[PDB]
Design a protein around this ligand. Sequence first.
Ligand code: 1UN
Lengths: 99, 99
Amino acid sequence: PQITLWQRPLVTIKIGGQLKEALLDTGADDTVLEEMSLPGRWKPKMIGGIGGFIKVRQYDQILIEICGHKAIGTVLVGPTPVNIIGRNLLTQIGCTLNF
Amino acid sequence: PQITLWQRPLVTIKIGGQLKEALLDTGADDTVLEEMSLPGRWKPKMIGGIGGFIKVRQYDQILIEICGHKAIGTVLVGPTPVNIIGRNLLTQIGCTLNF
Ligand SMILES: Cc1c(O)cccc1C(=O)N[C@@H](CSc1ccccc1)[C@H](O)CN1C[C@H]2CCCC[C@H]2C[C@H]1C(=O)NC(C)(C)C
């Protein structure tokens, strides 16, 4: 798809069998989702953005579908205001910025 | 142009005759630039990112040129680590996310 930006670029993703809405974010290096239980062992991690750092659980090799495209990568779970799909998964689905 | 996301999408912008590097961010609703003295009055404002809120100065009707493309809109100036070009300006240059 070609997504314009007059509105936030939110899309439906499927992860752990659940549908969730998430923001395509070229400014985020990582993918950070709201608190949820995923299978797998996880590692504590710290990530920062404007405002500061937050503690997150790092899950590796998680399967996630973004608008039907499959991606398998690291997903951070923690107290984010909104679900964010960062560059580690946007590259996997072949997403580019264009003008 | 088409910018891939292997690396952070940093591009050259020009504002008030000064060239600067800035991040194209579909996740940012606003444009936030590193501290700088712009003429004009401004309004105080608080914006939140991942770890919390920061105080910024809002300036209106600022002209920025992004890869030869002019945009004019509100810019927030505050102690950010990187200049962020948000959606309010990205839409003006016809920037789309494509996959
Ligand atoms: C989540 C994340 C990472 O995993 C790794 C690197 C950066 C980020 C990150 O938070 N990036 C942000 C840019 S701010 C930024 C700060 C430093 C470096 C690069 C970008 C997001 O792209 C945009 N970010 C998306 C999202 C983050 C959760 C809170 C709600 C928005 C807030 C918005 C944001 O911060 N907006 C401002 C107007 C304050 C700029």
